[PDB]
Design a protein around this ligand. Structure first.
Ligand SMILES: Nc1ncnc2c1ncn2[C@@H]1O[C@H](C[C@@H](N)CC[C@H](N)C(=O)O)[C@@H](O)[C@H]1O
Ligand SMILES: [Mg+2]
Ligand SMILES: [Mg+2]
Ligand SMILES: [Zn+2]
Ligand SMILES: [Zn+2]
Ligand SMILES: [Zn+2]
Length: 427
């Protein structure tokens, strides 16, 4: 198949990707497995190390007892890419390395022992942007500590430069990991892993992008979400949509070393609506969200729900649902109720997010597609067939663009649409 995309040198944002042919919304542009990936801090022992799917019971690697798998197939298939880190994870017990260190170990083993990776077809780990001449002294100190952490963790497998690729610099390698890591999300949009996809790392950022990525386990799909002309730069949004221009400025500086002067950032687009309600209340909710999100990252649903209900149904002052901190609380509560089987209560929170999600996820965004699908599924199983169908159709209109036929969630959605249709036909 001929490529619809190509690497090019941009005028002021380094290398990028641009369209070779005219592109339409939903068009599949690229697909990739990671060069290297690992389970996240919070999802370790909750999801399979290999397929990143959750299971009631996981089977642990007998040698390290750190890697956990859904099946014998996943444990065995993961063995070649786990063999060398196994000895390191076992040796350094009970200490567990930062996710970036575990990830870089897997990069090194892949580059040393594995065949050239399809993930590096357009751009390789060697080519990745490091932004070393923009790093602050504070960041360089942090990277030096990551380098020493890697040297300690990898002691059993990597003793010197002979066991690293030629002229491989660990400080530069961690600088590349900081601004090129992908957060892997499961079908429900829960963060479950971190990975490197060097060809996909050619995509520059936009606060209003024309492309979008989706994960199907560790597999990444890149799709157009707007019409794109020949030669037009392809962009993705690196950030959560529920962020003010000040919050985007801080992350883009701290993690990616750049300043954005796009229309949204120049006009603080949507900031005022995102921060409606009383500042003392949303500052408290924003602070509480640090704990709620940490609990959610560790799949502690009962504790997530308890903290969220204390806000949503507070005896004290409340926020509008369009306030992004209130909205994040509603979304955490919805996901906690779904995972706990409190479907009536999940629908209540989920329905409240629908109008704010319409506003903050314009066009076709996979996060809104999945949220609308969750609400439609909740309504379907409660027998609200005309309402469920409207939402399942809306979810399909978004997800046919953001997920496409190559994503297994689209098959799950088609089954809900057919189920809902049969129910309306028998009514
Ligand atoms: N909208 C943008 N404006 C300026 N620089 C950007 C923008 N988006 C991404 N970058 C740069 O690209 C880095 C992220 C890489 N994943 C993107 C490809 C990168 N431009 C390269 O040459 O390899 C960031 O850390 C910045 O250096
Ligand atoms: Mg460079
Ligand atoms: Mg530079
Ligand atoms: Zn598995
Ligand atoms: Zn092991
Ligand atoms: Zn911007």
């Amino acid at each position: 198949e001929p490529l619809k995309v190509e690497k090019f040198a941009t005028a002021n944002r380094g290398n990028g990707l641009r369209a070779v042919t005219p592109l339409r919304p939903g068009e599949l542009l690229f697909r990739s497995d990671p060069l290297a990936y690992t389970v996240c801090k919070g999802s370790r022992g909750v999801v399979c190390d290999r397929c990143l799917l959750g299971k009631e019971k996981l089977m642990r690697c007998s040698q390290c007892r750190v890697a956990k798998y859904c099946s014998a197939k996943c444990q065995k298939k993961a063995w070649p890419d786990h063999k060398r880190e196994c000895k390191c994870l076992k040796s350094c017990k009970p200490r567990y390395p930062p996710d970036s260190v575990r990830l870089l170990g897997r990069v090194v083993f892949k580059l040393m022992d594995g065949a050239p990776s399809e993930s590096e077809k357009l751009y390789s780990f060697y080519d990745l942007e490091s932004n070393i001449n923009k790093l602050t002294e504070d960041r360089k100190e942090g990277l030096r500590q990551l380098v020493m952490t890697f040297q300690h963790f990898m002691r059993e497998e990597i003793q010197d430069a002979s066991q690293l690729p030629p002229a491989f610099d660990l400080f530069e390698a961690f600088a590349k990991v900081i601004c090129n890591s992908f957060t892997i999300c499961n079908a429900e949009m829960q963060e479950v892993g971190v990975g490197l996809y060097p060809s996909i790392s050619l995509l520059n950022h936009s606060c209003d992008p024309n492309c979008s990525i989706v994960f199907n386990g560790p597999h990444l799909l890149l799709r157009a979400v707007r019409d794109i002309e020949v030669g037009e730069e392809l962009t993705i949004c690196y950030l959560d949509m529920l962020m003010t221009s000040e919050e985007r400025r801080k992350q883009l500086r701290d993690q990616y070393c750049f300043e954005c002067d796009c229309f949204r950032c120049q006009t603080q687009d949507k900031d005022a609506d995102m921060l409606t309600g009383d500042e003392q209340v949303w500052k408290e909710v924003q602070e509480s969200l640090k704990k709620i999100e940490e609990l959610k990252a560790h799949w502690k649903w009962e504790q997530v729900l308890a903290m969220c209900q204390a806000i949503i149904s507070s005896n004290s002052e409340r926020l509008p649902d369009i306030n992004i901190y209130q909205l994040k609380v509603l979304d955490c509560a919805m996901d906690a109720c779904i995972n706990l089987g409190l479907l009536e209560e999940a629908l209540f929170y989920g329905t409240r997010t629908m109008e704010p999600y319409r506003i903050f996820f314009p066009g076709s965004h996979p996060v809104r597609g999945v949220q609308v699908m969750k609400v439609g599924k909740l309504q379907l199983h409660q027998g609200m067939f005309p309402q469920a169908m409207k939402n399942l159709r809306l979810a399909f209109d978004i997800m046919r663009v953001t997920h496409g036929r190559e994503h297994s969630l689209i098959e799950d959605l088609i089954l809900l649409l057919e189920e809902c249709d049969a129910n309306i036909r028998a009514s």
